[PDB]
Design a protein around this ligand. Structure first.
Ligand SMILES: [Zn+2]
Lengths: 21, 30, 30, 21, 30, 21
């Protein structure tokens, strides 16, 4: 998931925004 | 904005900044 | 509580939170 | 010691509490 | 003072502390 | 540069001070 992707690879702020309430 | 490499607590700091008053869910794989 | 993997400054942040007003000693091996 | 154990392996908050004053 | 091993955001935290009100430039290689 | 040196090797606070304004 996002936690793993950001750490093993890279992620964007736009991808992170999907986890906001 | 630029792409990020974020592990551990650094990811949660990023979520806090992106989401602000909206809040967020932190959901690691187990 | 859960087990932790803590390196560098992250360990000191954890000690600060656990110990609060008690304070703590940080004593790395040299 | 604790500094090394938490980083090379894992440690608990209960182990950390032993370093409080 | 002691030598430092500083990666990612930890470097910027260090620059903030060293430079204070002087400010600083953060200039990574690309 | 400094960003890379501090992370791949080690750096001193005196080296960092050169990046203050
Ligand atoms: Zn870190």
């Amino acid at each position: 998931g996002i936690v793993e992707q950001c750490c093993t690879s890279i992620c964007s702020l736009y991808q992170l925004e999907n986890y906001c309430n | 904005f630029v792409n990020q490499h974020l592990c551990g607590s650094h990811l949660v700091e990023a979520l806090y900044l992106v989401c602000g008053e909206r809040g967020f869910f932190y959901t690691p794989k187990t």
